Structure formats: C-alpha cells, structure tokens
PDB file of C-alpha atoms in Angstrom:
ATOM      1  CA  UNK A   1      -1.177   6.391 -20.755  1.00 60.25           C
ATOM      2  CA  UNK A   2       2.155   5.553 -22.308  1.00 61.41           C
ATOM      3  CA  UNK A   3       3.652   1.995 -22.528  1.00 63.16           C
ATOM      4  CA  UNK A   4       6.962   0.998 -24.357  1.00 59.54           C
ATOM      5  CA  UNK A   5       8.877  -2.050 -24.820  1.00 59.64           C
ATOM      6  CA  UNK A   6      12.064  -2.214 -22.805  1.00 60.63           C
ATOM      7  CA  UNK A   7      14.617  -5.133 -23.002  1.00 60.34           C
ATOM      8  CA  UNK A   8      16.857  -5.499 -19.875  1.00 60.93           C
ATOM      9  CA  UNK A   9      17.312  -1.731 -19.467  1.00 61.40           C
ATOM     10  CA  UNK A  10      16.610   0.927 -16.764  1.00 64.17           C
ATOM     11  CA  UNK A  11      17.701   0.795 -13.206  1.00 62.83           C
ATOM     12  CA  UNK A  12      14.562   2.072 -11.664  1.00 60.65           C
ATOM     13  CA  UNK A  13      12.651  -0.073 -14.168  1.00 60.24           C
ATOM     14  CA  UNK A  14      14.612  -3.112 -13.487  1.00 61.20           C
ATOM     15  CA  UNK A  15      14.663  -2.397  -9.762  1.00 60.65           C
ATOM     16  CA  UNK A  16      10.997  -2.068  -9.718  1.00 59.75           C
ATOM     17  CA  UNK A  17      10.753  -5.250 -11.643  1.00 58.97           C
ATOM     18  CA  UNK A  18      13.170  -6.757  -9.204  1.00 53.94           C
ATOM     19  CA  UNK A  19      11.711  -5.449  -5.885  1.00 53.58           C
ATOM     20  CA  UNK A  20      10.750  -1.842  -4.946  1.00 51.76           C
ATOM     21  CA  UNK A  21       8.665  -2.321  -1.930  1.00 55.98           C
ATOM     22  CA  UNK A  22       9.832  -5.802  -0.759  1.00 53.74           C
ATOM     23  CA  UNK A  23       7.812  -5.500   2.267  1.00 54.43           C
ATOM     24  CA  UNK A  24       8.839  -7.610   5.306  1.00 59.08           C
ATOM     25  CA  UNK A  25       7.577 -10.834   6.261  1.00 59.73           C
ATOM     26  CA  UNK A  26       6.017 -11.648   9.608  1.00 59.74           C
ATOM     27  CA  UNK A  27       5.104 -15.208   8.775  1.00 58.51           C
ATOM     28  CA  UNK A  28       7.251 -17.822   6.847  1.00 57.73           C
ATOM     29  CA  UNK A  29       6.611 -21.471   7.437  1.00 56.59           C
ATOM     30  CA  UNK A  30       9.031 -24.059   6.612  1.00 57.53           C
ATOM     31  CA  UNK A  31       8.458 -25.532   3.179  1.00 54.84           C
ATOM     32  CA  UNK A  32       9.700 -23.582   0.282  1.00 53.71           C
ATOM     33  CA  UNK A  33      11.123 -20.110   0.868  1.00 53.45           C
ATOM     34  CA  UNK A  34      13.224 -20.115  -2.315  1.00 50.89           C
ATOM     35  CA  UNK A  35      11.148 -20.102  -5.332  1.00 51.60           C
ATOM     36  CA  UNK A  36      10.483 -17.307  -7.770  1.00 53.11           C
ATOM     37  CA  UNK A  37      11.652 -18.064 -11.350  1.00 53.09           C
ATOM     38  CA  UNK A  38      14.907 -16.507 -12.135  1.00 52.36           C
ATOM     39  CA  UNK A  39      15.418 -18.400 -15.224  1.00 55.43           C
ATOM     40  CA  UNK A  40      11.928 -17.583 -16.390  1.00 56.30           C
ATOM     41  CA  UNK A  41      11.553 -13.849 -17.265  1.00 57.88           C
ATOM     42  CA  UNK A  42      15.132 -13.731 -18.131  1.00 58.52           C
ATOM     43  CA  UNK A  43      14.801 -16.158 -21.033  1.00 56.82           C
ATOM     44  CA  UNK A  44      14.166 -16.317 -24.882  1.00 55.89           C
ATOM     45  CA  UNK A  45      10.924 -15.343 -26.621  1.00 59.78           C
ATOM     46  CA  UNK A  46      10.304 -12.968 -23.840  1.00 59.73           C
ATOM     47  CA  UNK A  47       9.158  -9.395 -24.132  1.00 58.83           C
ATOM     48  CA  UNK A  48       8.847  -6.799 -21.248  1.00 57.72           C
ATOM     49  CA  UNK A  49       6.379  -4.011 -21.650  1.00 58.47           C
ATOM     50  CA  UNK A  50       7.260  -0.837 -19.611  1.00 59.06           C
ATOM     51  CA  UNK A  51       4.742   1.767 -18.311  1.00 60.65           C
ATOM     52  CA  UNK A  52       5.656   5.414 -17.986  1.00 59.11           C
ATOM     53  CA  UNK A  53       3.093   7.791 -16.613  1.00 60.70           C
ATOM     54  CA  UNK A  54       4.476  11.225 -16.961  1.00 62.54           C
ATOM     55  CA  UNK A  55       8.428  12.108 -16.743  1.00 60.51           C
ATOM     56  CA  UNK A  56       8.925   9.166 -14.330  1.00 57.81           C
ATOM     57  CA  UNK A  57       8.374   5.410 -14.776  1.00 55.81           C
ATOM     58  CA  UNK A  58       4.920   4.072 -13.819  1.00 60.15           C
ATOM     59  CA  UNK A  59       5.719   0.407 -13.960  1.00 58.21           C
ATOM     60  CA  UNK A  60       6.424  -2.674 -16.090  1.00 58.86           C
ATOM     61  CA  UNK A  61       5.099  -5.934 -17.107  1.00 55.48           C
ATOM     62  CA  UNK A  62       5.887  -9.219 -18.940  1.00 52.97           C
ATOM     63  CA  UNK A  63       3.999 -10.895 -21.586  1.00 51.30           C
ATOM     64  CA  UNK A  64       4.683 -14.216 -23.488  1.00 53.70           C
ATOM     65  CA  UNK A  65       2.845 -15.789 -26.286  1.00 55.87           C
ATOM     66  CA  UNK A  66       0.761 -18.797 -25.539  1.00 54.52           C
ATOM     67  CA  UNK A  67      -1.749 -19.510 -28.057  1.00 53.20           C
ATOM     68  CA  UNK A  68      -3.196 -17.890 -31.273  1.00 54.52           C
ATOM     69  CA  UNK A  69      -5.723 -16.252 -29.196  1.00 57.02           C
ATOM     70  CA  UNK A  70      -4.395 -16.774 -25.666  1.00 57.27           C
ATOM     71  CA  UNK A  71      -2.190 -14.625 -23.602  1.00 55.65           C
ATOM     72  CA  UNK A  72      -0.636 -14.891 -20.159  1.00 55.15           C
ATOM     73  CA  UNK A  73       0.933 -12.417 -17.844  1.00 58.36           C
ATOM     74  CA  UNK A  74       3.303 -12.999 -14.869  1.00 60.12           C
ATOM     75  CA  UNK A  75       4.647  -9.661 -13.700  1.00 58.40           C
ATOM     76  CA  UNK A  76       3.230  -6.375 -12.269  1.00 55.28           C
ATOM     77  CA  UNK A  77       4.071  -3.776  -9.691  1.00 53.46           C
ATOM     78  CA  UNK A  78       1.898  -1.377  -7.818  1.00 52.15           C
ATOM     79  CA  UNK A  79       2.200   1.270  -5.074  1.00 51.67           C
ATOM     80  CA  UNK A  80       5.926   1.747  -5.616  1.00 49.60           C
ATOM     81  CA  UNK A  81       7.529   4.765  -3.828  1.00 46.78           C
ATOM     82  CA  UNK A  82       4.265   6.521  -3.333  1.00 50.32           C
ATOM     83  CA  UNK A  83       2.032   7.309  -6.439  1.00 49.77           C
ATOM     84  CA  UNK A  84      -1.529   6.980  -7.249  1.00 49.52           C
ATOM     85  CA  UNK A  85      -2.995   6.454 -10.708  1.00 50.83           C
ATOM     86  CA  UNK A  86      -3.221   2.746 -11.743  1.00 54.42           C
ATOM     87  CA  UNK A  87       0.353   1.547 -12.880  1.00 53.35           C
ATOM     88  CA  UNK A  88      -1.074  -2.015 -13.118  1.00 53.60           C
ATOM     89  CA  UNK A  89      -4.136  -0.555 -14.716  1.00 52.55           C
ATOM     90  CA  UNK A  90      -1.735   1.116 -17.244  1.00 51.73           C
ATOM     91  CA  UNK A  91       0.083  -1.860 -18.070  1.00 54.79           C
ATOM     92  CA  UNK A  92      -2.838  -4.163 -17.830  1.00 55.79           C
ATOM     93  CA  UNK A  93      -4.281  -1.908 -20.337  1.00 55.23           C
ATOM     94  CA  UNK A  94      -1.313  -2.453 -22.670  1.00 57.22           C
ATOM     95  CA  UNK A  95      -1.760  -6.119 -21.980  1.00 55.27           C
ATOM     96  CA  UNK A  96      -5.297  -6.310 -23.200  1.00 52.48           C
ATOM     97  CA  UNK A  97      -4.522  -3.759 -25.833  1.00 54.01           C
ATOM     98  CA  UNK A  98      -1.429  -5.786 -27.152  1.00 52.32           C
ATOM     99  CA  UNK A  99      -3.590  -8.874 -27.382  1.00 49.97           C
ATOM    100  CA  UNK A 100      -6.430  -6.746 -28.860  1.00 48.25           C
ATOM    101  CA  UNK A 101      -4.079  -5.775 -31.818  1.00 46.07           C
ATOM    102  CA  UNK A 102      -3.011  -9.353 -32.373  1.00 44.29           C
ATOM    103  CA  UNK A 103      -6.596 -10.438 -32.221  1.00 44.90           C
ATOM    104  CA  UNK A 104      -7.038 -12.410 -29.020  1.00 44.36           C
ATOM    105  CA  UNK A 105     -10.149 -13.482 -27.231  1.00 50.62           C
ATOM    106  CA  UNK A 106      -8.845 -14.586 -24.063  1.00 49.59           C
ATOM    107  CA  UNK A 107      -6.205 -13.691 -21.358  1.00 47.37           C
ATOM    108  CA  UNK A 108      -4.745 -15.615 -18.562  1.00 47.25           C
ATOM    109  CA  UNK A 109      -3.137 -14.608 -15.188  1.00 48.00           C
ATOM    110  CA  UNK A 110      -1.384 -15.964 -12.273  1.00 52.50           C
ATOM    111  CA  UNK A 111      -3.700 -15.704  -9.069  1.00 53.25           C
ATOM    112  CA  UNK A 112      -4.242 -17.583  -5.907  1.00 55.06           C
ATOM    113  CA  UNK A 113      -4.580 -15.855  -2.519  1.00 51.66           C
ATOM    114  CA  UNK A 114      -2.082 -13.628  -1.424  1.00 53.22           C
ATOM    115  CA  UNK A 115      -1.582  -9.857  -0.031  1.00 51.01           C
ATOM    116  CA  UNK A 116       0.221  -8.837  -3.264  1.00 51.83           C
ATOM    117  CA  UNK A 117      -2.220 -10.833  -5.332  1.00 54.18           C
ATOM    118  CA  UNK A 118      -5.311 -10.044  -3.171  1.00 59.88           C
ATOM    119  CA  UNK A 119      -5.434  -6.550  -4.781  1.00 60.60           C
ATOM    120  CA  UNK A 120      -3.999  -7.919  -8.137  1.00 61.75           C
ATOM    121  CA  UNK A 121      -7.209 -10.160  -8.387  1.00 61.05           C
ATOM    122  CA  UNK A 122      -9.335  -7.137  -7.663  1.00 60.14           C
ATOM    123  CA  UNK A 123      -7.633  -5.170 -10.347  1.00 59.24           C
ATOM    124  CA  UNK A 124      -8.296  -7.885 -12.812  1.00 59.67           C
ATOM    125  CA  UNK A 125     -12.007  -8.382 -11.756  1.00 58.09           C
ATOM    126  CA  UNK A 126     -12.122  -4.519 -12.178  1.00 57.38           C
ATOM    127  CA  UNK A 127     -11.114  -4.972 -15.832  1.00 53.69           C
ATOM    128  CA  UNK A 128     -13.525  -7.615 -16.728  1.00 49.68           C
ATOM    129  CA  UNK A 129     -12.050 -10.838 -15.398  1.00 49.07           C
ATOM    130  CA  UNK A 130     -14.288 -13.982 -14.627  1.00 44.71           C
ATOM    131  CA  UNK A 131     -13.436 -17.059 -12.776  1.00 44.63           C
ATOM    132  CA  UNK A 132     -12.326 -20.002 -14.778  1.00 44.72           C
ATOM    133  CA  UNK A 133      -9.891 -23.011 -14.741  1.00 41.72           C
ATOM    134  CA  UNK A 134      -6.726 -22.494 -12.880  1.00 42.78           C
ATOM    135  CA  UNK A 135      -3.349 -22.647 -14.559  1.00 42.17           C
ATOM    136  CA  UNK A 136      -0.576 -20.083 -13.973  1.00 44.06           C
ATOM    137  CA  UNK A 137       2.759 -21.476 -12.908  1.00 41.85           C
ATOM    138  CA  UNK A 138       1.242 -23.568 -10.328  1.00 43.16           C
ATOM    139  CA  UNK A 139      -1.533 -26.340  -9.470  1.00 45.66           C
ATOM    140  CA  UNK A 140      -4.811 -25.967  -7.879  1.00 47.22           C
ATOM    141  CA  UNK A 141      -5.165 -25.709  -4.101  1.00 44.97           C
ATOM    142  CA  UNK A 142      -7.638 -25.211  -1.234  1.00 45.05           C
ATOM    143  CA  UNK A 143      -6.334 -21.630  -0.789  1.00 43.16           C
ATOM    144  CA  UNK A 144      -5.947 -20.494  -4.355  1.00 43.89           C
ATOM    145  CA  UNK A 145      -8.401 -18.664  -6.704  1.00 44.24           C
ATOM    146  CA  UNK A 146      -8.113 -18.334 -10.489  1.00 45.26           C
ATOM    147  CA  UNK A 147      -9.862 -16.440 -13.360  1.00 45.30           C
ATOM    148  CA  UNK A 148      -9.656 -15.615 -16.999  1.00 47.07           C
ATOM    149  CA  UNK A 149     -10.131 -12.453 -19.050  1.00 48.95           C
ATOM    150  CA  UNK A 150     -12.807 -12.711 -21.711  1.00 53.79           C
ATOM    151  CA  UNK A 151     -12.487 -10.081 -24.531  1.00 53.31           C
TER     152      UNK A 151
END
C-alpha cells in the first residue's frame, strides 16, 4: 500500500514497535524471562520501514543487510487496535520489494513455534516461504521450525 522509512520517530509507530497488544501470559516457566534485544534494533546500520495503510499507521518493520543477495527480518506487528487488511503483508511486501530492487534471491526470517509466530509463519508461507536451515537469532530446537524465502 504505502511503506516509508522512519528513523526513531512516531509515538504510535514506536509504540507499536514497542508493544501495542502486549497480551497477558498464562504460563511463564523459570528459565529466561528477560531477553528481547534492546541493543539490537536500536543500533547502527539499521533501518526501520514503516507501513501506512490510509490516514493511519498500518505497522512497521526492521531490515538489516546480510549478504549480497540475502536479507533478514526481525520485527513485525499485526492485529493492533482492531484493523483488518494485512499489516505484516503490507510490510512483508516492502521487505521482498526492497530486496527485489537491490537484486536479492533469498530472504531469511525468525521463526520457531509461538503464538505470535504461529501466524507469522503462516503469513510467510502464504507469501512463498519454504522450509530450510534454521538461523535467526537463536539455535535449533525440538520445538522450533524455520524456513526461507526463495525469490
């Protein structure tokens, strides 16, 4: 629809990128309940793509260069207040498009097996994503799925 490049700006945009839904948890085992990546997105050589679907923000997304023809995404919101269209779809579109312009032939993503990812994985597979070697910002696991986007 309409994606722009926002750099640390927009309350609703930053808020969304921060936590819009932030649903409650009904299960939290003792292990590591304090890990996200504060000093990750908020770093150098980083660019945030915004998605505006109309007069209001649709969502945002992050993208960092990896290889000459390899891209990776680590950010995406959906649902939000209560809108239907395809925020992630819109962004995901710019993600692929962005790589398309550059001339990429592969796209990585961070998956596994979560409620927030459950659909995310479906969104990707709906865009043309096939299973492949795991990577993301984690390591393989018995309860984790990974895939790659082939242009």
